[PDB]
Structures are given as structure tokens and as C-alpha cells.
């Protein structure tokens, strides 16, 4: 079968298997079963499973070029694709918190899940706990057997936490570090002088490309029993910088993506992010235009947003992104040359994995 | 040293090691290690430590009766007090998330931690998370070598995953099951009829037993590598009903013990939360008496509330409970009894978590 329907089909067989286990093992009801039933599907299902999917073609590589009975080939790809599962349900877990903390109103189109009438927060911040704890039963079920049971848990762990510690860099970047303070409620950065393309950097590398790049790539390794074949630093670097370039086009599709296609209204500009566009807009900008800037930014007026985004547009930031683009793709391609040393059908898989970066939306 | 002050001792080294780790390999800053070393001693000291303190016991219990070099008891006495600081950083996850759910105001006479001006849902709910995060960097470090981690890995995640389903239950607990649906905001019941003995177990048994007792006793034998040596299904049982024992106590309390004293103001009938209360009321009230409360419950109206605990107050509830202890002290004797066949020693520290559970506020 094709790739994309095997990864969907784990998808029945993982989420019967779930709430059979609910019925049989924790007493739960035909009603709430069905809630979360459908909370699995609303908040799991919908998007592009470009996460999933990468373990799944990382593992596809290997097939190729690897002896193996078919019934081990059949053992790899359904590990593949219920892994690709954790980490779609990973995912799942951070949007449903984050659409609560941020006070999200859309996603994919359709309202936020904890804004469903018959979910509300109290409901919602729970549903995404147990997003997560379903990760964990999946690898302890599907995995128990495996090798590389151990390996997966301790990556999914570390790549979890990277992420908690990416949300609390990004939801602070706005305010000034020496002023942070659990006591006191905390004002907006006047100078904005920790808008740097470093800082940005730091909350970039921890909010999502441990989770988005990293964890797929090396999940397709274990589950090929193939990681001792690859240098790890490369991996780790090339996850990394493919994971900036996604969150970079992702700041800017937020701030200039018609909502119609974007799925939601975005609001970093009133939200006072530390964006690429701010941060490359500080990066040119003379005196005048600074002052404008600051008199504007992190403000729910909707005069100030357009004041904002007409900076961002005269300060020709299509070019300064033209220009990122060129130097990443000059870094991906020469780590994929560095990649083919010692793992050639690996360094396949990740030209892949850029070429899908690269040509979306 | 005493148990309780080795105990204080190793959240010190746990607490340096997690925030040394967060600036040494997650790019911390010092503000920022700040925040997060002031929200771990809010939410996780300050309490009894009854949760954690019994891995400890248990663990001394078999030191006294199994031949060790000295070196040995120490990395036991260490271990029990990890792992019953992961017991204790779940508990300040869930209290942290519930806190968040409930909207609630006040816990252990200080505002929860939401509600600290400098705090916020919006960094709350990820505090919570790196709570739990915690438990996991704690184990994968502390317990890298030792032949428990895969066992006590798996008997944290279920034990999790059971409490999650619970909270669930109990959110939902004053819906009718078959009016529960993500896409209809949810009313409240208006017969009742799911608030039965039965019902209220289940909901008891998931939201808290686990955590509270099946999690310490099981983590003690664990680090003990004594599990082999009781019998599980006994333990379980004996978990079950001290657990819910333990929460029909805090039901009780909710209701009639001061502020002062309980560290806020309890709203579970403003809230319509099936509590042991309202289930034993139930279970003896004449016509008239059930249509009182049917008008008065699950309403912040102060009035009605005060009707509600008029009800309880003539309802001679005092009666009940004191036949329900009396039954649970039968039970949970017999149990102690039972595990003397194979574990005397374990007996004894069982013995020990329900005479301080009994004696307690
Ligand atoms: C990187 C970038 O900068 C922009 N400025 C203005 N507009 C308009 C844009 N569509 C845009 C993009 C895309
Ligand atoms: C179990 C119980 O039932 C009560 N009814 C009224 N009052 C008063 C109580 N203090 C109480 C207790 C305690």
C-alpha cells in the first residue's frame, strides 16, 4: 500500500486499540469513549502528518537496501508508523495547551478544541494531558518487545522536555530577562534589545525543531535499528537548521498569509512576539524606524498591527528572507554531503525531507 | 538522619541538578533558572509529603531485615527519595492543571500558582507541564543503571494515565453520561441518578488512588527489588480502599472544615461535584429531602448553598461516616492481615500509611 494509507490505517488500529483499553481496563462508559473518540480524531486528524510521515520514509529508505523476511519489513514499517502516530499525538498535546494558554479562537479552519461548546478549558487542558499519555501507551504496547524500546522512550522524553522549555522561551520573549519575576506581572520590553537573531535562534531550536525534525529523523533511525550507522552531530545539526527554516517561513506566514488559507487570524504582532520579521525588520531599520516600531508593536489596535505591517512591507524584508533561504540551503546541502560519508540511503531521506520543507505553502 | 530530613535533603540535590542541567545544556538564563526554581518550590514543598515519604518507609522497612553493604542502604535511601519526589512533582502538576481547570483561587492558604501576577495561565499550564517533565529527567538520571527503571518507567505511566482518565471522570461527574457531547455545552443533571456508591468508587479510585497509594507502596517494593516477594493483587487492593478512604475524608472537609484550617474556601457543591456528600445524602433522603436538594445544588448562590450543607447537617451524615470508617478499618485489617502470609515486613509498613492516614486532620 501506499505510504500515507499505511500511516492512516495505524491510525484505526491505534485508536481501537486505545478505547478498547479504556472499556476493558478503565471502566469507562460508551459516552465518554465516544468524546474521546472524537477528541483524538479533532485534535490528531486534519493536518498534513508531515511529522509521521517522516518516520515512516526515513524507515522506507532502509527497506530498500536492507535484507529482511517480508514479515520483519511489515514489523518495521507499522513501528515506523506508530511512532510517526507519537509524535503526531506529541504535537496534538502542545497545540491543544498552547491554543489555551495563547487564548487561540482557530485552528485548521475550525474553532480551537477547548472552544468547542461541550469541551471548555476545564475539560481541554485535561484532553491534552491524556494526548500525551497516549503517546506513552502506544511505545510501552507496540514496542514492548523491541530493542529499541529504551532508545525511544529516553529520545521522546528529552525531545518533550526541549519543547516545555521552547514554549516557556517563546511566551516570555517579549519581556525583558532581568524584569522576569513570578511576583510581579510582567511588562512588555521597552527596547526590544533581546530581539536578536541569536535569541531568536535559542527559541526556535527548543520550541519546535526537537520535535518537528529531530525526533522524526532519529525515530526512523531505531526503528531501523540503524542509528549506530549515521553521525549523530549531523543529525542533530541539520534537524535543527531544516527546523529553523520551517518556523521562519511560519513567522511570516503569520503575519502576510490571508487567514482564509492560513486556517486562523494571526496575531504575533499583537501578541508581541519575538518574530523573525521583528527581528530582521531591528536588524535594517534606521532611527525613525525603530521609534515607529516601538510606539506600535504588541498592541491588540488594529491601527498599530497595520502601522506594524506596513513598516514590514517598506522595509523590503522579502529580500533579507530571499537571502536566508539562499544560506540555508547552501548549509542543508552541504550537510547532506556531509551525511553520505557514512549513510547514503539516509542522506536521500533527508533531501527529502528539505525538498518537502522547502516547496510548501 | 531522619527519614524526613534526608528526604528535604535530596529535593535540594535534585532541584540543583535540574536548574545546573538547564543552564548547562538548555541555554538558560539566570532569570529564567529563577522563575523556574521559585515555581518548583511553590508547587512542590509545603505540603506533608505524605506521597513521597511512604516510598521512603517502605524502603526502610526492608533495610531493617535485609543484609546490605553500608553503601547499599544508602543508594537505597536515595532512590526511595528520588522516586518519591517524582511521586510529589506529579502530585504539583495535577494540582497545578486542576488548579487551572477549576478556577480555582487559593491553595494551602497562598493563591494558586495560575493567579501569581508574574505567572499567568499563559505560563501555568507549561509550568505544569515541566512539572511532569521533571519526574521523567529524574528517573532516566537517577536510575540510569538500576535494574528497576524499565518497572518503575511503566508503573508511572499507567499510574498517570489512570489519574488523567480520573480527572476526566470527575469533571464530568454532574453531566448526565449519555447528554456528553464535545459539540453541545454540557448541563448539569437534573435527576442525579449517576450519583451512586458505584459511580462515586470509580471516579475515587482513578482521580486519586493511584498516585496517593498504589504509586508510593509499588515504587517502594521497586526500589526495594522486593515486588516479587508480596503479592500485587493484595497491594492493589489494599491502595484502593485507603485511597478512597482518604478522599472521602478531604470530600467531608471540603464541606464543613474551616478556611482557615482547609487553606481556601471549598466550592464542591457550587460546583455539583459527585462528593461523598451528596452521594450518602442520596442514599438516605426522603421525597421531600431529594427535591431540596435538587433546587439548591451546583449554584454559587450563597443561600443555596447554605441550604445544601442545612441538608447534610440534619441528614445526620456524621452517622454515616463513622459506619463507613468503621467498615474501611475492617477491610483494610484483613488486607494487613493477608499480606503477613508472604510479606510481614510489607504488612507492617502498610499498617503504618493507614494509621497515619486515620490520625490525620
Ligand atoms: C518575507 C516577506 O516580507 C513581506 N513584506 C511584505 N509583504 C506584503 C509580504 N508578502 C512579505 C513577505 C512574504
Ligand atoms: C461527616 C460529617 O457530616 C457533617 N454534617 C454536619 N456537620 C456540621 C459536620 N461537621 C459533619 C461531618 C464532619
Tied chains: 1, 2.
Excluded at 224 to 252: C, K, P
Aim: net charge negative.
Amino acid at each position: 500500500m501506499a505510504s500515507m494509507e499505511r500511516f492512516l490505517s495505524v491510525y484505526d488500529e491505534v485508536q481501537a486499540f486505545l478505547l478498547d483499553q479504556l472499556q476493558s481496563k478503565y471502566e469507562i462508559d460508551p459516552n465518554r469513549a465516544r468524546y474521546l473518540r472524537i477528541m483524538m480524531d479533532t485534535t490528531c486528524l486534519g493536518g498534513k502528518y508531515f511529522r509521521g510521515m517522516t518516520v515512516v520514509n526515513v524507515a522506507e529508505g532502509f527497506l530498500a537496501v536492507t535484507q529482511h523476511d517480508e514479515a520483519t519489513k511489515e514489523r518495521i514499517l507499522h513501528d515506523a508508523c506508530v511512532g510517526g502516530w507519537m509524535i503526531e499525538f506529541l504535537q496534538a498535546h502542545y497545540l491543544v495547551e498552547d491554543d489555551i494558554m495563547d487564548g487561540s479562537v482557530m485552528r485548521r479552519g475550525k474553532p480551537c478544541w477547548y472552544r468547542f461548546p461541550g469541551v471548555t478549558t476545564q475539560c481541554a487542558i485535561n484532553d491534552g494531558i491524556i494526548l500525551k499519555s497516549w503517546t506513552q501507551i502506544m511505545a510501552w504496547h507496540y514496542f514492548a518487545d523491541r530493542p529499541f524500546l529504551k532508545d525511544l522512550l529516553c529520545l521522546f522524553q528529552k525531545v518533550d522536555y526541549a519543547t516545555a522549555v521552547g514554549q516557556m522561551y517563546d511566551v516570555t520573549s517579549m519581556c525583558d530577562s532581568n524584569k522576569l519575576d513570578p511576583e510581579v506581572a510582567q511588562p512588555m520590553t521597552t527596547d526590544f534589545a533581546e530581539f536578536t537573531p541569536a535569541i531568536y535562534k535559542r527559541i526556535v531550536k527548543y520550541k519546535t525543531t526537537f520535535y518537528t525534525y529531530l525526533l522524526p529523523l532519529v525515530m526512523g533511525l531505531l526503528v531501523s535499528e540503524a542509528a549506530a550507522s549515521v553521525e549523530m552531530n549531523l543529525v542533530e545539526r541539520v534537524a535543527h537548521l531544516i527546523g529553523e527554516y520551517f518556523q521562519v517561513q511560519d513567522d511570516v506566514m503569520d503575519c502576510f498569509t490571508p487567514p482564509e488559507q492560513l486556517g486562523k487570524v494571526g496575531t504575533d504582532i499583537e501578541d508581541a512576539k519575538c518574530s523573525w520579521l521583528a527581528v530582521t525588520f531591528l536588524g535594517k531599520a534606521n532611527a525613525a524606524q525603530v521609534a515607529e516600531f516601538k510606539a506600535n508593536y504588541g498592541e491588540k489596535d488594529p491601527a498599530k498591527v497595520a502601522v506594524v505591517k506596513r513598516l514590514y512591507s517598506k522595509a523590503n524584508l522579502q529580500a533579507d528572507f530571499a537571502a536566508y533561504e539562499a544560506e540555508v540551503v547552501r548549509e542543508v546541502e552541504s550537510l547532506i554531503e556531509q551525511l553520505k560519508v557514512k549513510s547514503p540511503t539516509f542522506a536521500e531521506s533527508v533531501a527529502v525531507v528539505w525538498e518537502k520543507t522547502h516547496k510548501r505553502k
